[PDB]
Amino acid sequence: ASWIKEGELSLWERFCANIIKAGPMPKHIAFIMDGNRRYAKKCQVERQEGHSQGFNKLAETLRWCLNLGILEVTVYAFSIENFKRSKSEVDGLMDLARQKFSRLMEEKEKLQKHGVCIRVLGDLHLLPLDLQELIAQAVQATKNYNKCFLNVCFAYTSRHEISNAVREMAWGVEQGLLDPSDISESLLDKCLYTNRSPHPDILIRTSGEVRLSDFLLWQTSHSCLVFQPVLWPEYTFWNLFEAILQFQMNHSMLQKARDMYAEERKRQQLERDQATVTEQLLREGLQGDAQLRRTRLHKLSARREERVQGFLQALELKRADWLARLGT
Amino acid sequence: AAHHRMRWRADGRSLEKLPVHMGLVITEVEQSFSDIASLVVWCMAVGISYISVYDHQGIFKRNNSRLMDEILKQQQELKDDQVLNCHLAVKVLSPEDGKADIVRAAQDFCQLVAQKQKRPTDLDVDTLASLLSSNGCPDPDLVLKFGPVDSTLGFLPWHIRLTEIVSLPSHLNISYEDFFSALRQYAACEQRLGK
Ligand SMILES: C=C(C)CCOP(=O)(O)OP(=O)(O)O
Ligand SMILES: C=C(C)CCOP(=O)(O)OP(=O)(O)O
Ligand SMILES: [Mg+2]
């Protein structure tokens, strides 16, 4: 089927949505679409149909999200861990991906009309070369759309994403763009595949499984974890609705927590900074009553701002470069 | 009565599997040390090697001694070798043990990059994992989350990638049977590891 499944919410869906939209609504939901194989078994159907049904549900689910005014959605489609499955299965999964990403071109009309930007996050170099090219074109085609964001995590793990992000800032070091003392929380954030997106308000996993399975570990540390027993291909609007209801119940507490953590980080930063300014001034001699420390603080800050902004534009470069090269 | 040490070891040996490393995450911010201490010693009694204790407000970090005080007390009922075995097996954590520590390690690798000692390319997953180990401490297999919040709230994001997360509404009056129920849950879980 298509990628965009145009559907108007029904009466009860519509009504319950209105009541819910009165409270805090998530801006970004992420999904571990797990349980396709158990579903196929349950339905006495072939494995591949299970995964195909899984893709159908993703298309249906994105429409639900769009109808609720939730503009960003991240999904886990394929883990690096998944390569260890039988060649039969992974070839099947790889073929599915080819099919869907190829069909995306024939849907350019609906993509513009609906304004859906598609990003594919992972260690893509591990995929078959044909698939990389396919994905790359898909990404380039939608890059300028803005009404709805879908992030498909393919050949992805969290650890890989994290390592990659540190490697990227070690590359900044080797390329003399980054000095060790500039590596921080923010900078790491900004070197993840997910850097264009805010952290997900909700993370949902569909099997009865109570593990994250190496998914958005950094991004979902302060987010609402919802584990629902339903197998992914059987997901319903109401499952989603229950997720949002959990989010709304947790919202106040998770906000307090998120601010506390932010306030404590700015504190522990202004602390570790003010101290660096001390060693320098004690070793120099002069030590204040004419805003001496205050001026050394503006400096260390602006040094970072200029030099991190510099590292960033060069990282964006390198990403676009590999995007253009592999999607030509 | 010492037939209680034999019982608790029998309970552990009886489960299909036990966590080598258990995490205890407390989310509750309404108000309590004896309960947490009871959990810790139960863990030790059944045969769990490591126990982490975590709260997002760092209350336990700031109260390490008062906590280890109760643990050592509760532990004897059911001195220096006993103090060493709790320090080894029990870790008290706050947020700074999570992401901040990953930044910490990131920095330690970028100086080796400045030193022309290491190339960016040398940092696979496994290297980062090593830079992020203790000694014996593996990744926690089971985290018992207590309280109303559906979040790990910053608990070891890196290490928590395959951890089974079991939720209990409160730690306030926690019973052994309630604790063991969680262990039975973990023992029955299926781990596919991507296959
Ligand atoms: C590509 C993936 C991993 C889709 C999730 O469903 P599964 O393939 O994991 O099916 P289950 O074994 O979880 O039922
Ligand atoms: C793309 C998805 C949904 C991956 C989920 O992984 P699994 O279904 O393979 O994870 P485990 O249960 O084996 O840990
Ligand atoms: Mg599975």
From Swiss-Prot, chain A:
Assigned EC number: 2.5.1.87
Catalytic activity: n isopentenyl diphosphate + (2E,6E)-farnesyl diphosphate = a di-trans,poly-cis-polyprenyl diphosphate + n diphosphate
GO biological process: dolichol biosynthetic process; dolichyl diphosphate biosynthetic process; polyprenol biosynthetic process
Residues that coordinate or bind isopentenyl diphosphate: 34-35, 37-38, 85, 205, 211, 213
Subcellular location: Endoplasmic reticulum membrane
Phenotype for residue 42 to E: In RP59; 5-fold reduction in catalytic activity and reduced affinity for FPP but not for IPP
Free-text cofactor note: Binds 1 magnesium ion per subunit.
Gene Ontology molecular-function annotations: ditrans,polycis-polyprenyl diphosphate synthase [(2E,6E)-farnesyl diphosphate specific] activity; metal ion binding
Chief location bin: endoplasmic reticulum
tRNA processing keyword on record: no
Entry keyword Lipid metabolism: yes
Binding-site list for Mg(2+): 34
GO CC field: dehydrodolichyl diphosphate synthase complex; endoplasmic reticulum; endoplasmic reticulum membrane
Outcome when changing residue 15 to A: Markedly decreases phosphatidylinositol-mediated activation of cis-prenyltransferase activity resulting in products with longer chain length
Family designation: Belongs to the UPP synthase family.
Illness the protein is tied to: Retinitis pigmentosa 59: A retinal dystrophy belonging to the group of pigmentary retinopathies. Retinitis pigmentosa is characterized by retinal pigment deposits visible on fundus examination and primary loss of rod photoreceptor cells followed by secondary loss of cone photoreceptors. Patients typically have night vision blindness and loss of midperipheral visual field. As their condition progresses, they lose their far peripheral visual field and eventually central vision as well.
NCBIfam families, A to Z: uppS
Subunit: The active dehydrodolichyl diphosphate synthase complex is a heterotetramer composed of a dimer of heterodimer of DHDDS and NUS1. Interacts with NPC2.
Name this protein carries in UniProt: Dehydrodolichyl diphosphate synthase complex subunit DHDDS
Lineage: Eukaryota, Metazoa, Chordata, Craniata, Vertebrata
GN (gene name): DHDDS
Swiss-Prot record, chain B:
Glycosylation positions in this chain: 63, 173
Single Gene Ontology MF annotation: ditrans,polycis-polyprenyl diphosphate synthase [(2E,6E)-farnesyl diphosphate specific] activity
Catalytic activity: n isopentenyl diphosphate + (2E,6E)-farnesyl diphosphate = a di-trans,poly-cis-polyprenyl diphosphate + n diphosphate
UniProt-reported outcome of changing residue 194 to A: Almost complete loss of catalytic activity
Stated consequence of mutating residue 155 to A: Disrupts NUS1-DHDDS heterodimerization
Principal cellular location given in the protein's record: endoplasmic reticulum
Listed transmembrane segments: 36-54
Entry similarity comment: Belongs to the UPP synthase family.
Function: With DHDDS, forms the dehydrodolichyl diphosphate synthase (DDS) complex, an essential component of the dolichol monophosphate (Dol-P) biosynthetic machinery. Both subunits contribute to enzymatic activity, i.e. condensation of multiple copies of isopentenyl pyrophosphate (IPP) to farnesyl pyrophosphate (FPP) to produce dehydrodolichyl diphosphate (Dedol-PP), a precursor of dolichol phosphate which is utilized as a sugar carrier in protein glycosylation in the endoplasmic reticulum (ER). Synthesizes long-chain polyprenols, mostly of C95 and C100 chain length.
Note: NUS1 seems to exist in two topological orientations, a minor glycosylated species with its C-terminus oriented towards the lumen regulating NPC2 stability, and a major fraction oriented with its C-terminus directed towards the cytosol where it regulates cis-IPTase activity.
Protein name according to UniProt: Dehydrodolichyl diphosphate synthase complex subunit NUS1
Source organism of the structure: Homo sapiens (Human)
Full-protein interval shown: 80 to 293 of 293
